[PDB]
Structure 1
Amino acid sequence: PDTSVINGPDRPAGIPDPAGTTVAGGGAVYTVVPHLSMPHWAAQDFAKSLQSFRLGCANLKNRQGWQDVCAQAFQTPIHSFQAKRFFERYFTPWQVAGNGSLAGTVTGYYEPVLKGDGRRTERARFPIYGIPDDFISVPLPAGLRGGKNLVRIRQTGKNSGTIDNAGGTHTADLSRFPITARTTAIKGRFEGSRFLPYHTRNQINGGALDGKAPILGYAEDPVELFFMHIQGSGRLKTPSGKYIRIGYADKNEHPYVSIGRYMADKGYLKLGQTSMQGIKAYMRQNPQRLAEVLGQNPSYIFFRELDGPVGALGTPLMGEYAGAIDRHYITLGAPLFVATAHPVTRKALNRLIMAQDTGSAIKGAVRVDYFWGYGDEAGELAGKQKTTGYVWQLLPNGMKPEYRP
């Protein structure tokens, strides 16, 4: 998972910057410390951390600076002493401080499991859609993020187009598009002379995508399907007990609206019964409100077929041994020692996770989204996790951390 070992000569270890060496940028300060100044260093399950590092190396291998440690990872036995020595000998620890503080926020995320099936059945009735046949993504230059312009669009590929005012084939009225400050692409479809915003969740729920999109699977509950959209990935568990792994492909770009807030406004349930268990039970006694409530959130996620979801590094994540970081501050792929408390037991949760993912809301020098794995338990823990953490970034000897604006 892995268990294996590649034989051969130890890779060059290189030359560690000495303790107290400092890099600063973007309000952050990185400082080399001894491996032993990290809380409970020696006691950790380094064998799991090494299996986690090995998963990232399929892509991390190819990044300058990382070739030797990634080859060395596969020549190290999956045992905690050897793994510990690998991290101690091949990497230098950089304590991270953001805005003058070593303290930051650790939150949690997971991959939900839902009952479903690969083909439609009496129970698995709700389709999970791949990217539609007519779904067109068009890059939006920073210049147009005021979203007022009437532009022309030209198709350039099956699911892609470009803004071309002189030779575009269709008109797009950007004011009609859900464009905000962070927007880097608009999603739409060609229709007569126009390029129109893509279907909202309500239109999709009401069957806009019929015969027009790949279906990857069917879920049994539309509320849990709805929440998988929120998580951005998931796994179907078939009646056989088999898994269908499903990953983020794209989205319609329509805003996120919170249905818990809507539900609280209509009086349907109060703003405290706001959970997928509360909504799911409520929708079981009141099926006539389903279409209405779900369609309040216009955002809609499209998926693709893929053990572990694939993060920003392009690599499958190990439960409890990976997290999402801000790439402005943390070098993607780096081991990250995180010191924090377990969300439930309050026992020290001190460990080397692999910084293998990113997230739109994950911002700051000391800021981790802790990946808990897949399933119900992982989702409970993930939802309860909002703890203070302290972080150290381990980098290959001689590689410096960097603020990347």
Structure 2
Amino acid sequence: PDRPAGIPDPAGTTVAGGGAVYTVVPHLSMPHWAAQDFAKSLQSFRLGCANLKNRQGWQDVCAQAFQTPIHSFQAKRFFERYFTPWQVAGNGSLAGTVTGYYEPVLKGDGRRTERARFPIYGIPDDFISVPLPLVRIRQTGKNSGTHTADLSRFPITARTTAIKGRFEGSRFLPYHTRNQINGGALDGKAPILGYAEDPVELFFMHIQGSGRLKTPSGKYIRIGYADKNEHPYVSIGRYMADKGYLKLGQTSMQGIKAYMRQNPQRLAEVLGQNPSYIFFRELDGPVGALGTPLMGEYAGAIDRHYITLGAPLFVATAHPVTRKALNRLIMAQDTGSAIKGAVRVDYFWGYGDEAGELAGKQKTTGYVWQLLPNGMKPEYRP
């Protein structure tokens, strides 16, 4: 028994906030709307609904998504009948920026072998996260928070949700940095999820926040983001360029990997420049900001000041290699620290080497339309 659709704001309806303006337009104002693989967009929406279904105003669309066949004919009618498109302008411009991201595959093992020597660590035994409002700390769980803490020492910026540290003496000190962990500071006090063959490839898994080990027999060990040490991110590519070990055109993962194989005397130095370090957990698609697994080519990262999390999002852009028209109904199910603005999408390409090529080549103008359940308005969320 089909859910009711509810009443759309009529064409030309506007909402404004934050320099952004949202305008209701017809579905057929989206380029190549007719020719979409709406079965794939429906799959992607259904994945987000495991959590999105619980958010006020999304219950009916999420329920109805599961009573809709996985076929583009029916799935098109679902998106037409239940959602209204809101064309997005940021600061007077429909035009914005599309970049690309992906889930890396790297050679490795569940064990230390001759080939696979670089441990992937989970949350350490002494890693304690404390929420942020010369202070006092009390432990409230084996990895969360009797000891004094020196807040001037911890890496707080204008943005810090929590501090990460460990008890030592009668102190709470910042947790270990990448250079220290590289140097063996976690020996004996952190779970190891597996081993990578290449340390630069591992370094870049940290940069994407998730990955997959491909064992010598072709199996996958799936590795997801769990936490981090909250020390600042520094680009090693920008470090190498003015050192000047490589030119900032060869600053790709693959160029750093090749430089390092030829130059083992610089490995520790360069990797240690990024004091940020990500801890992982044993787990298709990484889990994004919505808390659900992302579907390759049908999910993206957005700015939540501007885009409602979980929303179908039509992106009109250019394919990062063919430069041909790339028009897609994706789901806005993730966020990034570098993704800001009304019209701004990090396009999730999926897992593996091919997705990697696509992602890095993506830096394009794009146009966006946000689809929301009929009646629900977009909102600037300061």
**TM-score, normalised via structure 2 length:** 0.97
Q: Indicate how the Cα distance of structure 1 residues 95 and 153 shifts in structure 2: closer, same or farther if over 3 A, else same.
A: same
Name the SS for the 1:255 alignment partner: coil
Name the SS for the 2:45 alignment partner: helix
Bigger Cα displacement from structure 2, 368-377 vs 260-269: 260-269
Offset at residue 56 of structure 1 (A): 0.7
Offset at residue 288 of structure 1 (A): 2.6
Offset at residue 36 of structure 1 (A): 1.0
Q: From 137, 142, 161, give the equivalent of 1:153.
A: 137
Distance 2:271 2:29 in 1: 50
Q: Indicate how the Cα distance of structure 1 residues 340 and 118 shifts in structure 2: closer, same or farther if over 3 A, else same.
A: same
Name the SS for the 1:217 alignment partner: strand
Distance 1:46 1:195 in 2: 52
Distance 1:154 1:25 in 2: 41
Distance 1:323 1:151 in 2: 40
Distance 2:251 2:350 in 1: 23
Distance 1:330 1:186 in 2: 28
Distance 2:94 2:170 in 1: 56
Distance 2:252 2:341 in 1: 28
Name the SS for the 2:238 alignment partner: helix
Name the SS for the 2:158 alignment partner: coil
Q: Alpha-carbon deviations, 1:84-138, whole Å to 9, x = none?
A: 1110011111111111111111111111110111122221111100010101112
Name the SS for the 1:157 alignment partner: coil
Q: Alpha-carbon deviations, 1:41-65, whole Å to 9, x = none?
A: 1111111111111111111111111
Name the SS for the 1:86 alignment partner: helix
Bigger Cα displacement from structure 2, 15-24 vs 315-324: 15-24
Q: Alpha-carbon deviations, 1:173-203, whole Å to 9, x = none?
A: 2222222111221111100111111111111
Offset at residue 266 of structure 1 (A): 3.3
Distance 1:86 1:284 in 2: 52
Distance 1:219 1:330 in 2: 37
Q: Alpha-carbon deviations, 1:300-323, whole Å to 9, x = none?
A: 111112210011111000101000
What's 1:69 paired with? 61
Distance 1:367 1:175 in 2: 34
1:207 is the counterpart of 2:187: no
Bigger Cα displacement from structure 2, 190-199 vs 15-24: 15-24
Q: Indicate how the Cα distance of structure 1 residues 62 and 281 shifts in structure 2: closer, same or farther if over 3 A, else same.
A: same
Offset at residue 215 of structure 1 (A): 0.8
Distance 1:193 1:276 in 2: 42
Distance 1:270 1:138 in 2: 40
Q: Indicate how the Cα distance of structure 1 residues 281 and 17 shifts in structure 2: closer, same or farther if over 3 A, else same.
A: same
Q: Indicate how the Cα distance of structure 1 residues 66 and 284 shifts in structure 2: closer, same or farther if over 3 A, else same.
A: same
Q: Indicate how the Cα distance of structure 1 residues 262 and 363 shifts in structure 2: closer, same or farther if over 3 A, else same.
A: closer
1:233 is the counterpart of 2:217: no
1:253 is the counterpart of 2:230: yes
Q: From 107, 111, 121, give the equivalent of 2:103.
A: 111
Offset at residue 264 of structure 1 (A): 2.9
Q: Alpha-carbon deviations, 1:310-353, whole Å to 9, x = none?
A: 11111000101000111111111110011111111111111100
Offset at residue 365 of structure 1 (A): 1.1
RMSD, aligned CA: 1.3
Offset at residue 257 of structure 1 (A): 2.0
Distance 1:95 1:242 in 2: 43
Offset at residue 286 of structure 1 (A): 2.2
Name the SS for the 1:123 alignment partner: coil
1:26 is the counterpart of 2:18: yes
Distance 1:267 1:349 in 2: 37
Name the SS for the 2:179 alignment partner: helix
What's 1:348 paired with? 325
Offset at residue 223 of structure 1 (A): 0.7
Name the SS for the 1:176 alignment partner: coil
Q: Indicate how the Cα distance of structure 1 residues 360 and 125 shifts in structure 2: closer, same or farther if over 3 A, else same.
A: same
Distance 2:156 2:8 in 1: 46
Distance 1:404 1:315 in 2: 22
In the TM superposition, 1:46-65 aligns within 5 A as 46-65=38-57
Name the SS for the 1:266 alignment partner: coil
Q: Indicate how the Cα distance of structure 1 residues 271 and 26 shifts in structure 2: closer, same or farther if over 3 A, else same.
A: closer
Structure 2: gaps spanning 5 or more residues: none
Q: From 58, 71, 89, give the equivalent of 1:79.
A: 71
In the TM superposition, 1:93-112 aligns within 5 A as 93-112=85-104
Offset at residue 390 of structure 1 (A): 0.8
Bigger Cα displacement from structure 2, 286-295 vs 337-346: 286-295
Q: Indicate how the Cα distance of structure 1 residues 367 and 264 shifts in structure 2: closer, same or farther if over 3 A, else same.
A: closer
Q: Indicate how the Cα distance of structure 1 residues 117 and 345 shifts in structure 2: closer, same or farther if over 3 A, else same.
A: same
Offset at residue 385 of structure 1 (A): 0.8
Offset at residue 354 of structure 1 (A): 0.2
Distance 2:22 2:242 in 1: 47
Q: Indicate how the Cα distance of structure 1 residues 266 and 29 shifts in structure 2: closer, same or farther if over 3 A, else same.
A: closer
Q: Alpha-carbon deviations, 1:119-165, whole Å to 9, x = none?
A: 22221111100010101112222xxxxxxxx11222122111xxxxx
Name the SS for the 1:42 alignment partner: coil
Name the SS for the 2:242 alignment partner: helix
Distance 2:238 2:324 in 1: 34
**TM-score, normalised via structure 1 length:** 0.92
Name the SS for the 1:10 alignment partner: coil
1:123 is the counterpart of 2:79: no
Q: Indicate how the Cα distance of structure 1 residues 266 and 36 shifts in structure 2: closer, same or farther if over 3 A, else same.
A: closer
